[PDB]
Amino acid sequence: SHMADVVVGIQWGDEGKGKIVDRIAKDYDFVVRYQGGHNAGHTIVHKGVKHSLHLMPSGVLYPKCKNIISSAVVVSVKDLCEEISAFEDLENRLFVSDRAHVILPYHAKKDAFKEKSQNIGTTKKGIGPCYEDKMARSGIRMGDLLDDKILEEKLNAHFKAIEPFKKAYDLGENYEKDLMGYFKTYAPKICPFIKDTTSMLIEANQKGEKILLEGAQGTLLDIDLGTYPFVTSSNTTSASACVSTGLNPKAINEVIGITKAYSTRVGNGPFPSEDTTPMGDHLRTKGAEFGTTTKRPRRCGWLDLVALKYACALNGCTQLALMKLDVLDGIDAIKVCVAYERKGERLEIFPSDLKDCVPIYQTFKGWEKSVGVRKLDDLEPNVREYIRFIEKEVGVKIRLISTSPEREDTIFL
Amino acid sequence: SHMADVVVGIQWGDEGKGKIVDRIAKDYDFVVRYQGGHNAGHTIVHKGVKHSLHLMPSGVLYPKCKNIISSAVVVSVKDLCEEISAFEDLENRLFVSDRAHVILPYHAKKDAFKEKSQNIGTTKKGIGPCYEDKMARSGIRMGDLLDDKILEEKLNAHFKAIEPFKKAYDLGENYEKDLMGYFKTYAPKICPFIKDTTSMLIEANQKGEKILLEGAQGTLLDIDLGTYPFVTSSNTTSASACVSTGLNPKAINEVIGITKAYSTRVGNGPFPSEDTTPMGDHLRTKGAEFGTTTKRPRRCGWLDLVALKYACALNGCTQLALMKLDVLDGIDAIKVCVAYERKGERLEIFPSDLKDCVPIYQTFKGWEKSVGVRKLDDLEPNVREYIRFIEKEVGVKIRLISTSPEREDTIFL
Ligand SMILES: Nc1nc2c(ncn2[C@@H]2O[C@H](COP(=O)(O)OP(=O)(O)O)[C@@H](O)[C@H]2O)c(=O)[nH]1
Ligand SMILES: Nc1nc2c(ncn2[C@@H]2O[C@H](COP(=O)(O)OP(=O)(O)O)[C@@H](O)[C@H]2O)c(=O)[nH]1
Ligand SMILES: O=c1[nH]cnc2c1ncn2[C@@H]1O[C@H](COP(=O)(O)O)[C@@H](O)[C@H]1O
Ligand SMILES: O=c1[nH]cnc2c1ncn2[C@@H]1O[C@H](COP(=O)(O)O)[C@@H](O)[C@H]1O
Ligand SMILES: [Ca+2]
Ligand SMILES: [Ca+2]
């Protein structure tokens, strides 16, 4: 247990990771995004001002933090440049790994094309196809932008390899021209931020500096251990934070699992505790469970402790942050899935195939007014019973409770 | 830091991981292969009998051990069944993850095709292309073989999708019918071994059972942090052992880095300490550096402490095993690369681009007769000083010393 703490979403994303990272970031020297891409959307709100970050790490509102975009991330350079322009004096407080892979316009076109047959429900941003080119070892990395010679060589090889797909993926007649001009525009803007971030973090850890690792997506979206194939293409577990930053597993200190008080997922795939009745629509409305751009409605349902115990085991959570209790204000009865029923069998442990798994619910008396509460003793007795039940059943202590989007509407326990 | 120990190769593979795992496995309840495929070849020798293992974990010679092939591995079913047939009574001591992905004949054909332009020097076994289909979320997994109907639907989608490539990858006209029969032959043989190994290791961790995780390839072949693109398509460091196994970073106890007393790599890519003179041929001859399918001569060179210190930081090694000291018997002067130089500038730290990096060598007086020695006190003084230098420079204690292929020719310190 060295100096590196990890924030991980333990459901299917959108749990409130951005809020928690921004709440705690001021006490860290480094804040690190370690996987995924701009498929992520992490929303921070403070004093009535909202920021929705996609690749920019969530320490950006504290100019003393050094924000790192690490090697297992996939980068859309134009979108990252558009984020950089929203903040002042990022030059010595944002660093992008020279080993991170680059998302090309072909990637999103391929994503949309494959989605016609696979119907996973991806964000159509080309995340998966970028990771495919990484495994092929044909992908372009951010360090390649530092030398026009190699970038040209690599683009030309890309140009020759995508030609049998120009018709299938609707690439266009100006693909080569437009891509070459894309890098002419964006490479000069991003190049000063490209660094060996592996060495930076190896040295920071050896020097005992405080490092916060910001997960994206959620544990149940993990490429290996999630609800495959309804998953993202990166590993999302806490150990993924070591795999590609330079830090080793023995550096990991606290593992903070972020869970909502109910469940959401966006996109297709299994969802044992989903609620498609008007009560599920109530959760969506009161929880504002729509896209970052307010477009993609989420599937909504109840908290699922079978899946939470599984995710907590995969990450080694030492604490939980319980988010959005205020969305449940005014609901008369709150259900929690405590086990699955499968063809007469009661399953206490999350199975590798959720086929025929029906939720078994325990019901809790509802509460009225948790919104904005900042003190434990101000919480209603019924909410405190709900919180106590979760800690006891999952076996991980709840150390943070959020009661609104606002940074300071957070109780520390 | 609980009960899971990790053995990791800290160079470019072939360091002696199979020997070390077999030497220590008897004291463990589980022995787990966690990434790669049958590109691995782990050689164990005991009492003049050799076993060359490819996907079989190296606990197989102790029937009380439970051997696990975990979820991030890629499985060639035919080759695994051929390994199964060489041992007696594997049924309750070998378990294959229902989440592991399956290598199809298409994959090796695509591998050879892409190699014509990329010239990485892969093993041509389809490892990379299998990982690509994983990222695409179109890949077939071991659990799919347990249900005839699901396997049918997935093989159909695969046949459809590979239509455009039948000519380009030299797929036969009999591809569909051959693969159909392949699974009719091999799925019955492998089905009894398919299990939810994620749940097995979650429970093993919770019960405090002793787990040994066996890495494949080596740290400098890591897809993210190795000598890209001259790497394998999986993560190879100790953190990968708790990404996809059902363990988590807090479970990792000892991390044993396996290093040869000199260096090899097979395939193309940078190699700062390579020796292409007749002394390099001598290392190849004396070290039998030709592989399992003895038709792949290795590139050889000297120990590189710059790369070694980098690999130890990425893995968090707590002890080192120094292998093949006996290969250096009779060499008058042993070189160790202690630093790099780049265009006249000295570099202490392993850089992200090895272009123009040349070795700075310190030389050591050689020895004559380390072969087969079993007590530290019986080693020649020059051997002892070489060992002390490595551990002092790298900062990790050398706790195992190997002096021949035989299991028992191993010194414990
Ligand atoms: N009502 C309420 N909203 C919250 C709370 N915490 C976060 N929010 C908001 O809920 C949304 C969280 O979804 P998102 O930002 O996608 O989560 P992330 O991806 O894990 O950072 C955002 O709109 C936050 O502003 C909370 O405790 N109560
Ligand atoms: N001369 C000598 N050979 C060894 C020693 N340890 C292992 N070997 C052999 O060296 C080879 C190691 O390469 P390999 O099996 O591919 O290593 P792995 O992939 O890391 O298990 C094998 O042929 C082993 O039998 C040693 O200490 N001395
Ligand atoms: O922003 C996120 N919030 C919630 N789910 C996401 C997010 N980004 C990707 N996913 C999910 O991850 C899966 C794969 O999408 P991809 O990451 O775009 O490939 C789908 O289920 C997505 O909805
Ligand atoms: O058996 C191994 N020993 C040494 N190198 C290996 C082994 N397996 C794969 N590699 C190396 O890993 C790289 C990629 O090969 P692939 O794993 O077949 O994709 C090449 O440099 C290979 O030589
Ligand atoms: Ca989100
Ligand atoms: Ca080997």
Residue numbers in the entry:
A (entry chain A), B (entry chain B): -1 to 411
The publication says:
Adenylosuccinate synthetase (AdSS) participates in both biosynthesis and salvage pathways of purines. Helicobacter pylori adenylosuccinate synthetase (AdSS) is present in solution in a dynamic equilibrium of monomers and biologically active homodimers. The addition of the His6-tag on the C-terminus (C-His-AdSS) was proven to have a negligible effect on the characteristics of this enzyme. This paper shows that the same enzyme with the His6-tag fused on its N-terminus (N-His-AdSS) has a high tendency to precipitate.
Two monomers of the enzyme occupy the asymmetric unit, forming a catalytically active dimer, with the Arg135 side chain participating in building the active site of the neighboring monomer. N-His-AdSS enzyme was incubated with GTP, IMP, Had (hadacidin, analog of Asp), and MgCl2 during crystallization, just like the C-His-AdSS variant was. However, clearly defined electron density for the Had molecule (HDA in the PDB denotation) is not visible in the structure. The shape of the electron density blob found in the approximate Asp-binding site of N-His-AdSS fits one sulfate ion, which could originate from the crystallization solution containing 0.2 M ammonium sulfate. One additional sulfate ion is found in the active site exactly at the position, which is occupied by the 6-Pi group of 6-P-IMP (IMO in the PDB denotation) in the structure of the C-His-AdSS variant. In accordance with the missing Had molecule, in the N-His-AdSS structure, the Asp-binding loop (residues 289–294) is moved away from the active site (Cα of Thr291 moved by 6.1 Å) and is poorly defined in the electron density. The electron density blob in the supposed Mg-binding site did not fit the Mg ion, so the Ca ion was placed there instead, as it made a much better match. The calcium ion is coordinated with six oxygen atoms: from α- and β-phosphate of GDP, the backbone carbonyl group of Gly39, the side-chain carbonyl group of Asp12, and two sulfate ions present in the active site in the places of Had and 6-Pi group of 6-P-IMP. Since no His6-tag handle is visible in the N-His-AdSS structure, it can be concluded that it is too flexible to be observed, and obviously not so firmly bound to the protein as in the mentioned case of G. stearothermophilus purine nucleoside phosphorylase. The buried surface area between monomers in the structure of N-His-AdSS is 2422 Å2 (as calculated with Pisa, version 1.52), which compares well with 2342 Å2 calculated for the structure of C-His-AdSS.
